[PDB]
Design a protein around this ligand. Structure first.
Ligand SMILES: CCCCCCCCCCCCCCCCCC(=O)OC[C@H](COP(=O)([O-])OCC(O)COP(=O)([O-])OC[C@@H](COC(=O)CCCCCCCCCCCCCCCCC)OC(=O)CCCCCCCCCCCCCCCCC)OC(=O)CCCCCCCCCCCCCCCCC
Ligand SMILES: CCCCCCCCCCCCCCCCCC(=O)OC[C@H](COP(=O)([O-])OCC[N+](C)(C)C)OC(=O)CCCCCCCCCCCCCCCCC
Lengths: 57, 77
């Protein structure tokens, strides 16, 4: 009725702070893993060159 | 021989019930050293070195309810 309640009440602030920091860390890790992937596609000049060769030019 | 008597804490028990029906923080302790036995980090003990905390706190409360209030005249230890 007296002791354990008081010590729990004393614990609350530090635990709240640490859990907030942990959530911020999770969000930071989520953001840090985001990279924009620039894809590379076959240049159409080679396609045009192959078209010309097929014409026997 | 069986003597029936009572302690002199009934009013203090009433006050404890009245003022501790709701939680309150404790930040000042008579014997704080029972909570901090290790001062150098990375040191740990496999023995239940923190078992004495509850008994320490209860003994402090009991002896303080008795002795400190005994200064009041006619209060009995
Ligand atoms: C022959 C004559 C009679 C006597 C017979 C005796 C037989 C003895 C047999 C042999 C025994 C040998 C060994 C003895 C060793 C003694 C050592 C000793 O004394 O050490 C000191 C030591 C002192 O301790 P303390 O630090 O003062 O704290 C103990 C306190 O009790 C306070 O501690 P606590 O507050 O932490 O306790 C918890 C407390 C938590 O707090 C509370 O609950 C608050 C209340 C506290 C009550 C207890 C305190 C009592 C205060 C004094 C008396 C109050 C008024 C009584 C009025 C009587 C009027 C005549 O809760 C309780 O106490 C639970 C009980 C609550 C009862 C509530 C009842 C409600 C009824 C409502 C009815 C409504 C009806 C409506 C109908 C409507 C119709 C229309 O005593 C003890 O630790 C206890 C010793 C007991 C040993 C066992 C004895 C055997 C049992 C006897 C029972 C007799 C019942 C019949 C009696 C009938 C009337 C005459
Ligand atoms: C942490 C430190 C705490 C320090 C507390 C300091 C308190 C200062 C008090 C100043 C004087 C007060 C005078 C009160 C007078 C009352 C009426 C009277 O006649 O008294 C005469 C009595 C006795 O005076 P007397 O000896 O002159 O009586 C003469 C009577 N004849 C002639 C019949 C013998 O006064 C006292 O006993 C006062 C002593 C107080 C000592 C300090 C006690 C502190 C511990 C108890 C704290 C309780 C807090 C509880 C809170 C709730 C807890 C959940």
């Amino acid at each position: 009725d007296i002791m354990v309640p008081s010590f729990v009440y004393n614990k609350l602030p530090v635990i709240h702070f640490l859990q907030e920091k942990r959530a911020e860390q999770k969000l930071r890790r989520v953001l840090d893993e985001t990279y924009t992937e620039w894809t590379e596609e076959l240049d159409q000049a080679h396609v045009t060159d192959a078209i010309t060769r097929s014409l026997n030019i | 021989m069986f003597l029936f008597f009572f302690c002199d804490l009934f009013w203090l028990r009433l006050l404890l019930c009245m003022y501790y029906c709701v939680w309150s923080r404790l930040c000042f302790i008579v014997y704080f050293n029972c909570l901090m036995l290790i001062f150098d980090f990375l040191l740990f003990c496999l023995f239940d070195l923190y078992l004495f905390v509850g008994l320490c706190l209860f003994l402090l409360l009991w002896f303080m309810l008795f002795n400190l209030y005994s200064l009041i005249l006619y209060y009995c230890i």
